[PDB]
């Protein structure tokens, strides 16, 4: 399996209510492992998974120190940007940063990414080159010359090919119990009369990690069912994920359609068809 | 591990 470490950062200005709300979260794959919240009484970076709790004081001190310096950058930028866009001091705006590193089955570096957003739109994105910047509008171009001048891309590259993939691997080891598990879908199926002419079959996949998965139907033909009601995969909130796909079928051909679940946790792709 | 690099004003 490919793996990924991702840091997500959210700063919301709220003038007259004091300093901007700042929420940092760390993920490895689909497992959140740290968080910061400027509004919690801690003012520390804090664990959100068992395997990171085993790191010592210098790690928490450091992640706390770094995370606060990210939140301070964002404080300045809510100001600078409000300026660049000629917006008033009243009214609340959002800055979002995301960055991390992919690795493949070899745990070797694969890609790196670092993007910024103002008010839910792309502001500045590092390209896959880990060197070139894409800039949305005349304003992002100003940030672009600033960052090119100071070789921000070089610095991030260092982190992104260096520290990022190293500590990703260090987490994948320490947390082998959590992170390199593969919980297979527990799967049932449901029936529902819609008409005298039409039924509904639902393919349930519940209690699977990681969250990547494929639910697809067919019958009498390898070519799937073109059109299918499938829901966005959703966190069960215990650590696993859930998802169904469902299709509408003739009263006649109930037990003729079949559902095809694919998942790293499945030695071979599962296959199911209706039975009372 | 958070970056200690390349985190820069806009």
């Amino acid at each position, epitope marked *: 399996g490919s793996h990924s470490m991702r840091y997500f950062f959210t700063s919301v200005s709220r003038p007259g209510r004091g300093e901007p709300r700042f929420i940092a979260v760390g993920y490895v794959d689909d497992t959140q492992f740290v968080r910061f919240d400027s509004d919690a009484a801690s003012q520390r970076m804090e664990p959100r998974a068992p395997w990171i709790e085993q790191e010592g004081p210098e790690y928490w001190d450091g992640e706390t120190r770094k995370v606060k310096a990210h939140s301070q950058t964002h404080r*300045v930028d809510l100001g600078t940007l409000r300026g660049y866009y000629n917006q008033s001091e009243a009214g609340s705006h959002t800055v979002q940063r995301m960055y991390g590193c992919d690795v493949g089955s070899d745990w070797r570096f694969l890609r790196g990414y670092h993007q910024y957003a103002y008010d839910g739109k792309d502001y500045i994105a590092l390209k896959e080159d880990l060197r070139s910047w894409t800039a949305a509008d005349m304003a992002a171009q100003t940030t672009k010359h600033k960052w090119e001048a100071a070789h921000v891309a070089e610095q991030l590259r260092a982190y992104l090919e260096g520290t990022c993939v190293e500590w990703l691997r260090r987490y994948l080891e320490n947390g082998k119990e959590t992170l390199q598990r593969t919980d297979a879908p527990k799967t049932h199926m449901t029936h529902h009369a819609v008409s005298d002419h039409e039924a509904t079959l639902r393919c349930w996949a519940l209690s699977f990690y990681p969250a990547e998965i494929t639910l697809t139907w067919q019958r009498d033909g390898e070519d799937q069912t073109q059109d299918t009601e499938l829901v966005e995969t959703r966190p069960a909130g215990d650590g696993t994920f859930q998802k169904w796909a469902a299709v509408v079928v003739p009263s006649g051909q109930e037990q003729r359609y079949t559902c095809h679940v694919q998942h790293e946790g499945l030695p071979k792709p599962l296959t199911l068809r209706w039975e009372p | 591990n958070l970056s200690a690099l390349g985190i820069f004003s806009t």
Partner: T-cell receptor
Amino acid sequence: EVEQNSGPLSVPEGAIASLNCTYSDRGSQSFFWYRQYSGKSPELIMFIYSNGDKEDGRFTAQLNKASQYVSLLIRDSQPSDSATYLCAVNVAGKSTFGDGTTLTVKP
Amino acid sequence: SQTIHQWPATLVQPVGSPLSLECTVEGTSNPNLYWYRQAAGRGLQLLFYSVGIGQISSEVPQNLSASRPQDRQFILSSKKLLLSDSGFYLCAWSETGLGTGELFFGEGSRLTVLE
């Protein structure tokens, strides 16, 4: 922790001075040589963050993150290069300094 | 330098005197700011780290205090100096954020405390 040898490290005028600095923290992410003439405040001479060599005039740094050291070589040493040379490592937004390496360039 | 001034430059003061050292900085906005001390050797010990105005962090517990009234004004103080507080007190600033980590230093304040 960051370790560099106290001098006095004595080197003849014109030779290469080789200064070294080890560090233990796998959290480290950038690396610095400062120069401090006595009575005075440190001034940066080198920053490096990618494994390799970086050369500015008569100064060359070598960072190795695997072997966990950063070197400074001063080729063609002047007696005016005589100074205390401070190594510094960014662990987690905190620059930690070694106790410095004193260098006399004998004229 | 010209981006960062610091005073007073040299101080002889008896055990139990109060201490005020001032650091101005000009030509940057929203710097990180640092109080370093050099004593009993070369090599800098970090005393105070400041990510922004009014925000100070004490990195070791101590009979010294610091405050950042303005973006570009940093103060280190004591109510009662101990012998141990002898040292070369250095103010430094760093670009907003975690950039490269370059520290620009003031010309330092040399404090000798006598019994």
